[PDB]
Every structure is written in structure tokens, then in C-alpha cells.
Design a binder for this molecule. Structure first.
Ligand SMILES: Cc1ncc(-c2nc3c(OC4(C)CC4)nc(Nc4cnn(C5CCN(C)CC5)c4)nc3cc2F)cn1
Length: 277
């Protein structure tokens, strides 16, 4: 816990950082978070190799390793190693066979839709991961469905601690105070509220070809009685029940309070999600 890898070992296990997608015979799994993620192999383990303002990127790399060293939990991704050249930076993680929550909600690459039952477990798991971070006095600063990874049993794993500490983030998930420059765990709660709406609706947080463009704005439509939560429930499920959907929506609505001090803390969010099932 944890090794340094030679840049050449990682280059060799990712077929020379083969930028072609897995489907074509390459090693590229994705791109985001200032990098490209490649599928690699270390003896009995499939791994994810993330190949990464010059000095600011190195600070993000060092920060992530620091967070990983301190924060070990069932609902946080596990770092296996790192490389560091030179001007070549790699982070090696336990491979998550089910990718991100974002991609599973959109059924990317033809994966079947997540059941309401699975969605409830993922929401609980993600809240448990955030609770571990907040209990250990860390603010994530980039809570989003792309940063919630899914293992072999669809267990939620909080990812990307590159921005974490004691104006950056993703605009569609950011709390008003975060957009103004404030750093608070209360902003993580707001972002988790957007994730909960993505879980209920199966809709992305932002869509330029949609009315409203921002998913968080459906809260206003529902409050003003222009729409109902029933109207927005992801139709790609057969096992959703109005009671538990309304209970998850009530949590999301509380998380999305415009006034940071009126939002529940992560312990309250966990309690509410536990009561839901
Ligand atoms: C800072 C930081 N950065 C990245 C990680 C991290 N990232 C990924 C990851 O990132 C992506 C989502 C972008 C590709 N992907 C996967 N695995 C995967 C990817 N695609 N799939 C598919 C294969 C096709 N089928 C059809 C459906 C599932 C499985 N594991 C990961 C494991 C990690 F630790 C952690 N921390």
C-alpha cells in the first residue's frame, strides 16, 4: 500500500497507451479529469491507468495520492500505484468493471438499465463514501455521477480526489456559494442532490438540447406544480414505487436548498436514505 511503477511497465501493459477504444482492439476506456484512462494488467489484476497549470497538475497528482493514503472505505476507489517520470504522470487504480454511474444511467455501450433496487443501493453507497470524507474533514469539491464508479457488485465508489482538501468543479453540479468561491462540505451536499436527481430521472445534469437545460431546475418546476416527480421518473425501470421515489426526491430537494445552512448534513442524508428502504 502502494507501489511506484516504471512508466515503461505501464506503457507496456496498456499496449503503448493505445488510444483506440477497447471495442476496436485498443486500451482506451475513457477520457475526463485531465486525462485518458487505459485498461492495463498486473499479474492477477486488471487495472485502470489514468495518464494525466504545469505545476498545478503535479499538485493535483500529489493531492490525490495524499487523500488515498488517508481515506480507505468500501465506498471510495482504491489506488494501487503511481508512476511519476519526468513530465509523464500515471495513477493506477483497481479496475471498476461497471464503469461510472453517469454511463450506466445513460446505458452507454448497450449496458442494461439499472433497476430502482440497484439505484437505491448506489445512492446509499455514494452517501456512505461522502460521509467517510466529511467525518475525516475532507471536502470532495467535484461530486458528480462521472465520479461515482461501480464495481463487480454495483457498489458505489467515490472517485477523483484531485480537487479535494480540508473556482473549480463542474458547473451543472455546483452550489451557488461554490460558484462564488466558497469552500464548504455543504456544497458537496448540493452536488449529491443533483446526482440523486440523475438517479431518479436517468437524465444528464446538463443538456443544451433540453428544457430545462439544467436538471437541478426541475426542482422549481415541481415546487411551482408545473410538473410532478412522477412525470420525471426514469421510464427505463419496472420496479420503482412512488413512496420510495418521493422519499429519494425529498432528500434531493433538501440537498438542493439554495441556502447552504438549510441543507441537511451528510449524516442526515444517510439516515433519510436508510429510512427510504
Ligand atoms: C482520479 C481517478 N480517475 C479514474 C479512476 C478510475 N476510473 C475508472 C474508469 O474510468 C472511466 C469511467 C473513464 C473510463 N473506468 C473503469 N472501468 C470501466 C470503464 N468502462 N468500463 C466499461 C467497459 C464497457 N462496458 C460495456 C461497460 C463498462 C469499465 N474503472 C475505473 C477505475 C478507476 F479507479 C479513479 N480515480
Amino acid at each position: 500500500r502502494f507501489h511506484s511503477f516504471s512508466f515503461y511497465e505501464l506503457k507496456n501493459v496498456t499496449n503503448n497507451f493505445d488510444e483506440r477504444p477497447i471495442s476496436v482492439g485498443g486500451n482506451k476506456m475513457g477520457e475526463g479529469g485531465f486525462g485518458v484512462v487505459y485498461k492495463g494488467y498486473v499479474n492477477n489484476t486488471t487495472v485502470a491507468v489514468k495518464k494525466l497549470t504545469t505545476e498545478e497538475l503535479k499538485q493535483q497528482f500529489d493531492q490525490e495520492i495524499k487523500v488515498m493514503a488517508k481515506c480507505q472505505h468500501e465506498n471510495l476507489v482504491e489506488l494501487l500505484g503511481f508512476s511519476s517520470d519526468g513530465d509523464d504522470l500515471c495513477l493506477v487504480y483497481v479496475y471498476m468493471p461497471n464503469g461510472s454511474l453517469l454511463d450506466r444511467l445513460s446505458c452507454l455501450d448497450g449496458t442494461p438499465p439499472l433497476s430502482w433496487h440497484m439505484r437505491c443501493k448506489i445512492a446509499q453507497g455514494a452517501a456512505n463514501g461522502i460521509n467517510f470524507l466529511h467525518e475525516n474533514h475532507h471536502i470532495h469539491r467535484d461530486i458528480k455521477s462521472a465520479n461515482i464508479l461501480l464495481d463487480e457488485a454495483f457498489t458505489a465508489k467515490i472517485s477523483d480526489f484531485g480537487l479535494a482538501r480540508a473556482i473549480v468543479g463542474t458547473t451543472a453540479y455546483m452550489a451557488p456559494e461554490a460558484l462564488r468561491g466558497e469552500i464548504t462540505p455543504k456544497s458537496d451536499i448540493y452536488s449529491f442532490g443533483v446526482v440523486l436527481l440523475e438517479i431518479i430521472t436517468g437524465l444528464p445534469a446538463v443538456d443544451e438540447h433540453r428544457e430545462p437545460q439544467l436538471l437541478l431546475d426541475i426542482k422549481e418546476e415541481i415546487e411551482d406544480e408545473e410538473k410532478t416527480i412522477e412525470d420525471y421518473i426514469d421510464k427505463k425501470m419496472n420496479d420503482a414505487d412512488s413512496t420510495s421515489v418521493e422519499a429519494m426526491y425529498s432528500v434531493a430537494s433538501q440537498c438542493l436548498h439554495e441556502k447552504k445552512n438549510k441543507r441537511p448534513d451528510i449524516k442526515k442524508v444517510q439516515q433519510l436514505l436508510q429510512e427510504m428502504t
